[PDB]
């Protein structure tokens, strides 16, 4: 039974959870639906500047409504109330949306780099480009596929949550993606690679090249590019730093509970700020969506 209930703490966890996650959710929806309104009203920019924005918008939809409420449900009491069916698909779609958003940012950066640094070189952003956005999701499916099926929930037998609601049932949460000792670290490492070193290096090198071939008002592009690179680095640093620390070296303290209950939702908040800040960075400041 393990007793326990939603009261991880009395005031602070509930307060910050409800308030902060409500704010990030509302900002996400308003920005994303505003971007959708502009792109649907758009008539002169049916080129990449609309299709890649639609892809980023729908990835925002998933990285919002498909990850935030399930995270609230998981962090309320102990885990997923309705499980043994939902866990697999929910986890894979959350990973799908996160990876898709990261690779969409990478792809749009590559497109800008190519079309600016090499303006008269492969101007085609045609149905071939459309196939590129159709296939980035396939790449996300392929990278998260090996850890998708083998994401069984197992069973927390000691956790039969019965505290006040009279809800006698086996409570369990998705246990692990790999049982063969260090293969969990192996797939975490390959995800670390594909999400945070190859994309990071590509973005920083191409962005520095863009800044160099640009001016050494026209410095706003360089300033905003550096700002967005720094923001993307710093927002996704907390999550995977936390995973790296929790995987390599156990804290061995009541902190092993305190940091998990406190910083992990804070880190998720910083990461999900991408879902609300990408619309404001990409859809508002381009000055061609702002025209209508």
């Amino acid at each position: 039974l393990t007793f326990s209930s939603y009261y991880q703490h009395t005031s602070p966890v509930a307060a910050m959870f409800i308030v902060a996650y409500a704010l990030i959710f509302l900002l996400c929806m308003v920005g994303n639906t505003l971007v959708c309104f502009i792109v649907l009203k758009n008539r002169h920019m049916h080129t990449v500047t609309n299709m890649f924005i639609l892809n980023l918008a729908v990835s925002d939809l998933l990285v919002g409504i498909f990850c935030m409420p399930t995270t609230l449900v998981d962090n309320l009491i102990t885990g997923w109330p309705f499980d043994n069916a939902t866990c697999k698909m929910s986890g894979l779609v959350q990973g799908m949306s996160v990876s898709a958003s990261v690779f969409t940012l990478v792809a749009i950066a590559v497109e800008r780099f190519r079309c600016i640094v090499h303006p008269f070189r492969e101007k085609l952003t045609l149905r071939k480009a459309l196939v590129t956005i159709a296939v980035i999701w396939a790449l996300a499916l392929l990278i998260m596929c090996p850890s998708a099926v083998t994401l069984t929930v197992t069973r927390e037998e000691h956790h039969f949550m019965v505290d006040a609601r009279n809800r006698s049932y086996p409570l369990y949460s998705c246990w692990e993606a790999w049982p063969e000792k260090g293969m969990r670290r192996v797939y975490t490492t390959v995800l670390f690679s594909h999400i945070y070193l190859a994309p990071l290096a590509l973005i920083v090198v191409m962005y520095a090249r863009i800044a160099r071939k640009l001016c050494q008002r026209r410095a706003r592009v360089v300033h905003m590019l550096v700002m967005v690179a720094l923001f993307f680095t710093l927002s996704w640093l907390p999550l995977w730093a936390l995973l790296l620390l929790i995987d390599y070296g156990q804290l061995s303290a009541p902190q092993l509970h305190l940091v998990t209950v406190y910083a992990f939702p804070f880190a998720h908040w910083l990461a999900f700020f991408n879902s609300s800040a990408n619309p404001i960075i990409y859809g508002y400041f381009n000055e061609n969506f702002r025209r209508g």
């Binding site: 326990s4 995270t71 885990g79 990973g95 927390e156 949460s173 246990w175 999550l239 209950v261």
Partner: peptide, 7 residues
């Protein structure tokens, strides 16, 4: 307690 759910 088990609340390590990533992504």
């Amino acid at each position: 307690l088990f609340q390590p759910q990533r992504f």
